């Protein structure tokens, strides 16, 4: 019943070419979890724990939560971890999906493992995203930093384009978080 019920740990090492043996896909820049591509059997240097399977969602690297980050950030975390690499993953299916916007829509019970992971994934997405809003600029705010200040029409285009990972209203104004860029 729980989103995190099938989370497992796979301990791997770098293959003889220094790589992981699988490509990382998704990332917040596609509105997605980081998740694994095709796991070629024999390209992963397994160490302990459980095996990796294709298209599982990558949650943590050496106990650093990475879901909600770009692929840039995820690989940057990987690069600063010495072997062995402890990966926490979950297979997609049922309630578990790589789509970040839909995962942020889910209503979990406050205090649940599911809820705590959702807030962790929000903070990560917030690290490199600047929110957008239709309210007017207030004194002291830096456009492009505290907010992107856009009109209602522009906010509706971003929403209709699927650019927003999260949307809401407060005192008759629009707030949202756009997908981060690849830079």
């Amino acid at each position: 019943s729980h989103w995190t019920s099938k989370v497992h740990e796979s301990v791997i090492g770098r293959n003889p070419e220094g790589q992981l043996g699988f490509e990382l896909k998704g990332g917040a820049e596609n509105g997605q979890f980081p998740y694994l591509g095709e796991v070629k059997p024999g390209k992963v240097a397994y160490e302990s724990g459980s095996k990796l399977v294709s298209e599982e969602l990558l949650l943590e690297v050496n106990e650093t939560p990475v879901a909600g980050l770009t692929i840039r950030d995820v690989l940057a975390v990987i690069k600063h971890c010495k072997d062995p690499l402890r990966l926490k993953c979950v297979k997609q299916g049922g309630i578990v999906d790589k789509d970040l916007r839909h995962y942020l829509n889910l209503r979990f019970q406050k205090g649940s493992v599911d809820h705590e992971l959702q807030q962790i994934i929000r903070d990560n997405l917030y690290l490199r995203t600047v929110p957008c809003t239709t309210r007017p600029h207030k004194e002291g705010e830096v456009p492009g930093v505290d907010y992107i200040f856009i009109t209602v029409e522009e906010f509706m285009e971003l929403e209709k384009s699927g650019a927003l990972l999260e949307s809401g209203t407060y005192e008759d104004n629009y707030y949202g978080t756009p997908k981060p860029p690849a830079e």
Binding site: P131, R135, V145, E166, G168, T169, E171, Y175
Partner: peptide, 11 residues
Amino acid sequence: NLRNQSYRAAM
């Protein structure tokens, strides 16, 4: 960076 109270309410 971190979101204000207003943004957090809007969600």
